[PDB]
């Protein structure tokens with residue numbers, strides 16, 4: 001309902017975790033689980049490549065269609081670009097239904 | 104080739120194939136008799152009010168001619184839109200021309 005493709009076997013969940021690294025333990029044995037760990041975090045890159053199949057348009061509509069377009073006249077900033085502060089932003093929601101089709 | 108047989112069909116279409124697009128258009132035309140079948144010397148000088156910048160000498164002929172030197176002769180509005188919204192450029196490669204289903 002929120003939109004999209006419903007899949008019985010969707011892309012799998014990808015779980016990740018930093019392995020706990022004990023800080024020095026006591027010198028004489030104790031049953032209790034360790035609760036003192038070295039403070040750490042991780043970082044790295046991640047890549048996702050997806051192949052999409054397109055269904056080309058085959059319309060005999062004579063007149064031009066509606067199309068998503070960038071604004072023409074001057075503006076303080078560029079839509080879908082960064083700030084003077086380096087902040088990226090999406091000015092508006094962009095749908096998918098521009099071309100038309102008969103029923 | 105007979106009186107009762109069409110000598111061609113109506114081909115009007117467009118197909119996009121990759122780095123190519125083929126346009127095809129057919130139209131119905133009418134051709135009258137021009138100049139009463141004659142060739143005539145036509146001229147315009149500097150008499151009356153006709154300025155010198157517009158003088159000329161030439162001829163009118165009994166012939167007509169086909170012309171399709173205009174993009175809309177080949178691209179429908181939608182096709183033109185498909186072209187200009189997605190390509191950095193384009194150019195003509197080859198053409199076929201045909202005259203048929205002639206009736207006098």
Ligand code: NA
Nearest residue numbers: 069070071079
């Ligand atoms: Na935009």
